[PDB]
């Protein structure tokens, strides 16, 4: 709520407690759906926490931090006296003032981060804790965290391209609702959301997103289903990067029209492929990093990958 980002209003020494309102699964229960045994599981939950927007005035594009209950084995073994699990960050998926501007909650899009044969081998601590939350449970929170990945704070006319993979879709749900419905600013540009995942059933919030597309014209939705589609260029898996190449003109519109690029999701450093595809389109032949830093400097690039 209330524009202008604040960070670290809550640290591990003064956490913020939040009660769980809802925690619903968004992907097929294990065994159902397209992902075969040998490829493990893709269990993605949508999690809604009740908070006091007065005490936790977050801004969409920011991250919330969670502290999983318990003692970190590695820390105890190293004997740290801290021992408590270190914070895990998650992209806030709800719009600044919540859906319907009720200012009553905050939401996350979290996936069980396991390893896996097809059977489980290692089990992510925090992601599973979250996905195991029951309505009424209390969550230890930190933040807000981050103040770079943000929307314009004044009226905007340039086009905006959202590039997401998997859970990276989170920030773009809130941002999409805020730009198209909440209108905290007069936005007159075109939104292009390029969203990628392994299987069609692992694309989450689709009903909502497709609905956004049919209601606006202001908003186009493209998907890259990597394990069901091959790109037309090299016949490899279809990634969002290949979609960018197909959207050469929407890309050019942004490069020359003062638009913005938001890239979010995994795996770590997945922005490289997307960025150097944008560079091909611009035709600029500087080094990858010279082009990337230029865009960021020009406020036309925003990247959060993990
Ligand atoms: C800015 C930011 C935003 C993020 N947003 C989201 C988001 O919106 N949604 C989301 O789901 N995640 C998001 N993440 C990731 C999140 O922060 C966590 O890193 C992630 O959920 C996994 O945390 P974990 O505690 O469950 O995994 P950890 O317990 O820290 O384990 C990490 C990985 O290591 C593996 N592992 C554990 N033990 C071993 C071992 N002995 N040998 C080999 N491997 C092992 C685990 O299986 C796991 O896959 C974000 C991260 C960042 C930095
Ligand atoms: N277990 C792994 O080592 C592994 C495997 C794939 C990606 N990531 C996954 O990404 C995180 C989230 O998983 P999720 O179930 O929410 O969905 P997801 O596995 O993250 O899928 C996101 C999409 O990005 C694609 N991709 C992989 N490398 C890329 C690059 N360099 N440039 C552009 N796109 C790329 C993936 O294609 P693919 O069909 O080739 O994966 C996938 O379709 C992690 O949990 C991790 O599982 C790492
Ligand atoms: Zn509308």
XYZ file of C-alpha atoms and ligand atoms in Angstrom:
408
model
C 0.000 0.000 0.000
C 0.908 3.708 -0.094
C 3.372 4.135 -2.965
C 7.105 4.652 -2.388
C 8.909 1.392 -1.456
C 10.172 0.693 2.052
C 12.639 -2.093 2.766
C 13.652 -4.128 5.809
C 10.834 -2.836 8.008
C 11.170 -6.288 9.556
C 14.314 -8.356 10.061
C 14.966 -11.667 11.813
C 15.284 -9.804 15.125
C 11.861 -8.172 14.736
C 9.815 -10.394 12.378
C 6.226 -9.747 11.326
C 3.675 -12.439 12.141
C 0.968 -13.205 9.585
C -1.923 -15.668 9.722
C -2.553 -17.933 6.738
C -5.875 -17.261 5.016
C -5.554 -19.786 2.194
C -3.098 -22.219 0.614
C -4.457 -23.913 -2.502
C -2.653 -26.145 -5.005
C -2.566 -24.784 -8.562
C -1.008 -27.716 -10.411
C -2.260 -31.303 -10.751
C -1.776 -33.496 -7.685
C 1.263 -35.752 -8.029
C 0.555 -38.520 -10.526
C -2.116 -36.567 -12.369
C -1.024 -34.228 -15.141
C 1.530 -34.494 -17.915
C 4.859 -34.533 -16.049
C 5.964 -38.211 -15.979
C 7.408 -39.980 -12.919
C 11.054 -39.808 -14.100
C 10.776 -36.003 -14.164
C 9.783 -35.648 -10.516
C 6.916 -33.423 -9.397
C 5.724 -29.884 -10.098
C 3.594 -28.829 -7.121
C 2.904 -25.088 -7.133
C 0.801 -23.458 -4.409
C -0.875 -20.068 -4.205
C -0.568 -18.741 -0.665
C -2.571 -15.872 0.823
C -1.537 -14.285 4.113
C -3.538 -11.733 6.097
C -1.516 -8.646 7.008
C -1.834 -5.076 8.234
C -1.058 -2.899 5.216
C -0.334 -0.160 7.760
C 2.581 -2.085 9.261
C 3.771 -3.783 6.072
C 3.295 -1.219 3.251
C 4.713 -3.306 0.411
C 4.827 -2.341 -3.252
C 4.236 -4.859 -6.033
C 7.549 -5.976 -7.507
C 9.031 -6.365 -4.038
C 9.881 -9.584 -2.214
C 8.649 -10.888 1.111
C 10.887 -12.938 3.374
C 9.969 -16.032 5.360
C 11.766 -17.739 8.231
C 11.051 -21.492 8.368
C 10.544 -22.868 11.898
C 13.372 -24.999 13.282
C 17.147 -25.265 13.540
C 19.392 -25.417 10.473
C 21.333 -28.717 10.779
C 24.351 -27.319 8.934
C 24.436 -24.341 11.297
C 24.229 -26.503 14.410
C 27.004 -28.731 13.060
C 29.137 -25.661 12.403
C 27.979 -24.505 15.842
C 26.896 -20.941 15.120
C 24.730 -19.983 18.105
C 22.493 -18.432 15.450
C 21.376 -21.847 14.203
C 17.989 -20.539 13.031
C 17.157 -21.039 9.357
C 18.227 -18.138 7.159
C 15.534 -16.126 5.354
C 14.004 -17.310 2.077
C 12.676 -14.684 -0.346
C 9.489 -14.916 -2.428
C 8.106 -12.581 -5.086
C 4.990 -10.816 -3.834
C 2.256 -11.838 -6.276
C -0.590 -9.639 -5.018
C -1.018 -6.039 -6.234
C 0.106 -3.183 -3.975
C -3.269 -2.701 -2.277
C -4.356 -6.341 -2.719
C -6.937 -7.571 -5.224
C -9.997 -5.328 -5.021
C -7.827 -2.932 -3.018
C -9.080 -4.431 0.247
C -5.612 -3.892 1.724
C -6.275 -7.050 3.729
C -3.724 -9.566 2.446
C -0.518 -10.488 0.619
C 0.043 -13.433 -1.725
C 2.818 -15.741 -2.933
C 3.293 -18.277 -5.733
C 5.521 -20.977 -4.258
C 6.742 -24.297 -5.635
C 8.060 -27.277 -3.686
C 11.784 -27.107 -4.411
C 12.967 -30.723 -4.372
C 15.725 -32.676 -6.129
C 14.799 -36.209 -7.214
C 14.797 -42.168 -10.953
C 11.817 -39.885 -10.340
C 11.670 -40.318 -6.571
C 12.519 -37.601 -4.043
C 16.172 -37.243 -3.049
C 16.406 -33.859 -1.331
C 13.677 -31.671 0.136
C 13.705 -27.867 0.185
C 13.061 -26.581 3.698
C 11.118 -23.336 3.302
C 9.180 -24.015 0.097
C 7.732 -27.196 1.596
C 7.007 -25.500 4.913
C 5.008 -22.884 3.028
C 3.219 -25.390 0.787
C 2.309 -27.340 3.926
C 0.698 -24.336 5.622
C -2.838 -24.790 6.894
C -5.404 -21.989 7.208
C -4.871 -20.373 10.605
C -1.156 -21.126 10.815
C 1.232 -18.279 11.596
C 4.062 -17.280 9.263
C 7.202 -15.477 10.414
C 7.882 -12.694 7.910
C 10.679 -10.315 6.920
C 10.967 -7.285 4.647
C 9.772 -5.928 2.397
C 12.897 -6.656 0.354
C 14.142 -4.965 -2.811
C 13.474 -1.645 -4.518
C 14.691 -1.990 -8.103
C 12.127 -4.317 -9.682
C 9.272 -1.791 -9.717
C 6.582 -0.260 -11.930
C 6.695 3.405 -13.004
C 5.463 5.678 -10.207
C 4.123 8.263 -12.661
C 1.891 8.142 -15.746
C 3.445 5.919 -18.409
C 3.019 5.657 -22.188
C 5.691 3.146 -23.180
C 4.977 -0.527 -23.810
C 5.837 -3.067 -21.107
C 6.983 -6.650 -21.676
C 6.767 -9.200 -18.860
C 9.013 -12.240 -19.252
C 8.406 -15.053 -16.777
C 9.325 -18.696 -16.249
C 7.616 -20.907 -13.676
C 7.075 -19.121 -10.367
C 8.585 -16.038 -12.010
C 5.012 -15.288 -13.052
C 4.303 -14.102 -9.505
C 5.164 -10.379 -9.677
C 3.422 -10.079 -13.038
C 0.032 -11.143 -11.689
C -0.034 -8.243 -9.255
C 1.503 -5.840 -11.761
C -1.008 -6.814 -14.444
C -3.989 -6.250 -12.141
C -2.541 -2.966 -10.897
C -1.852 -1.509 -14.347
C -5.129 -2.627 -15.931
C -7.594 -2.310 -13.034
C -6.200 -0.294 -10.111
C -4.814 2.485 -12.300
C -2.633 4.052 -9.608
C -1.217 5.708 -12.721
C -2.470 6.476 -16.223
C -0.922 3.677 -18.269
C -1.399 4.004 -22.029
C 1.137 1.463 -23.278
C 0.737 -2.151 -24.386
C 1.468 -5.067 -22.055
C 2.933 -8.237 -23.540
C 3.231 -11.134 -21.101
C 5.515 -13.953 -22.210
C 5.158 -16.859 -19.806
C 7.014 -20.174 -19.915
C 6.816 -23.543 -18.164
C 7.565 -27.244 -18.842
C 3.958 -28.389 -19.399
C 0.620 -26.716 -20.145
C -0.701 -27.859 -16.765
C 2.250 -26.188 -15.037
C 1.192 -22.787 -16.319
C -0.613 -21.320 -13.300
C -3.242 -18.574 -12.976
C -4.072 -19.196 -16.637
C -7.820 -18.688 -16.240
C -7.086 -15.280 -14.730
C -4.437 -14.350 -17.310
C -6.443 -15.466 -20.348
C -9.333 -13.492 -18.898
C -7.127 -10.418 -18.712
C -6.273 -10.866 -22.381
C -9.874 -11.113 -23.572
C -10.966 -8.117 -21.501
C -8.422 -5.523 -22.607
C -6.619 -5.666 -25.977
C -4.241 -3.588 -23.874
C -2.767 -6.947 -22.891
C -1.445 -9.860 -24.965
C -0.552 -13.285 -23.571
C 2.078 -15.600 -25.039
C 3.262 -18.907 -23.591
C 6.360 -21.062 -24.032
C 5.682 -24.668 -23.062
C 9.220 -26.029 -23.325
C 8.503 -29.762 -23.202
C 5.524 -29.709 -25.578
C 6.767 -27.178 -28.116
C 9.874 -26.814 -30.259
C 10.913 -23.407 -31.594
C 10.932 -22.678 -35.322
C 14.521 -21.435 -35.374
C 16.695 -24.355 -34.236
C 14.043 -26.967 -33.463
C 15.031 -27.043 -29.813
C 12.777 -26.619 -26.789
C 10.462 -23.601 -26.888
C 11.705 -21.025 -24.383
C 10.441 -17.503 -23.723
C 13.609 -16.328 -25.462
C 12.371 -17.783 -28.755
C 9.039 -16.047 -28.181
C 10.915 -12.771 -27.826
C 12.501 -13.417 -31.218
C 9.024 -13.982 -32.655
C 7.849 -10.706 -31.107
C 10.565 -8.677 -32.834
C 8.323 -5.648 -33.334
C 6.803 -5.485 -29.865
C 10.428 -5.692 -28.754
C 11.471 -2.868 -31.082
C 8.509 -0.765 -29.944
C 9.879 -1.014 -26.413
C 13.492 -0.356 -27.401
C 12.570 2.837 -29.248
C 9.433 3.855 -27.357
C 10.877 4.118 -23.860
C 9.242 0.863 -22.810
C 10.408 -1.531 -20.106
C 11.516 -5.161 -19.880
C 10.803 -7.204 -16.754
C 12.443 -10.626 -16.538
C 11.664 -12.941 -13.628
C 11.948 -16.647 -12.835
C 14.453 -19.477 -13.110
C 16.843 -20.935 -13.462
C 19.515 -18.533 -12.216
C 20.892 -16.465 -15.090
C 18.091 -17.377 -17.493
C 17.938 -13.689 -18.397
C 21.100 -13.981 -20.492
C 19.367 -15.841 -23.326
C 16.396 -13.481 -23.233
C 18.557 -10.363 -23.100
C 20.912 -11.316 -25.938
C 17.836 -12.078 -28.032
C 16.646 -8.532 -27.386
C 20.132 -7.378 -28.366
C 20.000 -9.181 -31.715
C 16.761 -7.327 -32.453
C 18.228 -3.945 -31.511
C 21.257 -4.743 -33.656
C 23.620 -3.262 -31.081
C 26.960 -5.096 -31.150
C 28.457 -4.053 -27.823
C 29.293 -6.753 -25.302
C 26.378 -8.530 -23.627
C 27.139 -6.704 -20.400
C 27.497 -3.299 -22.077
C 24.052 -3.751 -23.602
C 22.534 -5.067 -20.378
C 23.950 -2.313 -18.165
C 22.903 0.295 -20.696
C 19.286 -0.883 -20.610
C 19.219 -1.081 -16.814
C 20.771 2.380 -16.733
C 18.133 3.566 -19.175
C 15.477 2.128 -16.868
C 14.359 -0.247 -19.608
C 15.587 -3.460 -18.002
C 14.623 -5.110 -14.719
C 15.807 -8.612 -13.869
C 15.155 -10.928 -10.923
C 16.180 -14.534 -11.535
C 16.924 -17.427 -9.191
C 14.412 -12.665 -5.240
C 13.867 -14.058 -5.141
C 12.529 -14.306 -5.421
C 12.026 -15.600 -5.332
N 10.698 -15.835 -5.611
C 10.189 -17.112 -5.524
C 8.846 -17.346 -5.804
O 8.111 -16.413 -6.129
N 8.344 -18.628 -5.716
C 9.169 -19.676 -5.349
O 8.716 -20.818 -5.271
N 10.502 -19.443 -5.069
C 11.018 -18.165 -5.154
N 12.351 -17.934 -4.871
C 13.207 -19.055 -4.349
C 13.141 -19.117 -2.827
O 13.810 -18.003 -2.280
C 13.799 -20.382 -2.293
O 15.165 -20.364 -2.636
C 13.150 -21.639 -2.862
O 11.756 -21.610 -2.639
C 13.731 -22.898 -2.228
O 13.889 -22.704 -0.839
P 14.010 -23.980 0.132
O 14.328 -23.557 1.544
O 12.748 -24.795 0.080
O 15.236 -24.792 -0.513
P 16.555 -25.158 0.327
O 16.218 -25.920 1.584
O 17.368 -23.921 0.605
O 17.327 -26.097 -0.716
C 17.699 -25.564 -1.965
C 17.788 -26.724 -2.938
O 18.862 -27.562 -2.563
C 18.425 -28.901 -2.509
N 19.175 -29.665 -1.499
C 18.893 -29.765 -0.164
N 19.822 -30.566 0.404
C 20.689 -30.974 -0.549
C 21.811 -31.789 -0.512
N 22.168 -32.380 0.624
N 22.515 -32.035 -1.672
C 22.102 -31.468 -2.860
N 20.986 -30.658 -2.889
C 20.292 -30.415 -1.752
C 16.948 -28.828 -2.166
O 16.244 -29.934 -2.678
C 16.522 -27.557 -2.861
O 16.096 -27.867 -4.165
C 12.858 -16.650 -4.963
C 14.197 -16.399 -4.684
C 14.701 -15.104 -4.773
C 16.146 -14.831 -4.474
N 15.781 -29.504 -11.285
C 16.592 -28.672 -12.174
O 17.771 -28.756 -12.145
C 15.916 -27.681 -13.146
C 15.309 -28.159 -14.481
C 14.668 -27.083 -15.440
C 14.607 -25.571 -14.972
N 14.832 -25.273 -13.505
C 13.626 -25.161 -12.680
O 13.221 -23.741 -12.532
C 12.786 -23.536 -11.125
C 11.220 -23.503 -11.026
O 10.639 -24.719 -11.490
P 9.022 -24.726 -11.975
O 8.357 -26.210 -11.741
O 8.164 -23.568 -11.151
O 8.959 -24.416 -13.614
P 10.417 -24.297 -14.400
O 11.182 -25.768 -14.350
O 11.236 -23.279 -13.760
O 10.157 -23.853 -15.977
C 10.467 -22.543 -16.399
C 10.810 -22.670 -17.910
O 12.117 -22.011 -18.192
C 12.777 -22.929 -19.138
N 14.233 -22.666 -19.170
C 15.364 -23.514 -18.563
N 16.667 -22.808 -18.857
C 16.352 -21.531 -19.637
C 17.250 -20.403 -20.208
N 18.709 -20.464 -20.045
N 16.635 -19.276 -20.934
C 15.125 -19.205 -21.111
N 14.225 -20.328 -20.537
C 14.836 -21.455 -19.821
C 12.412 -24.342 -18.654
O 12.527 -25.275 -19.734
P 12.894 -26.897 -19.423
O 11.644 -27.869 -19.885
O 14.239 -27.314 -20.272
O 13.128 -27.086 -17.991
C 10.994 -24.180 -18.219
O 10.098 -24.579 -19.218
C 13.386 -24.656 -10.291
O 12.433 -25.193 -9.403
C 13.882 -25.717 -11.259
O 13.172 -26.939 -11.069
C 15.979 -26.088 -12.882
Zn -10.127 -4.155 -16.857
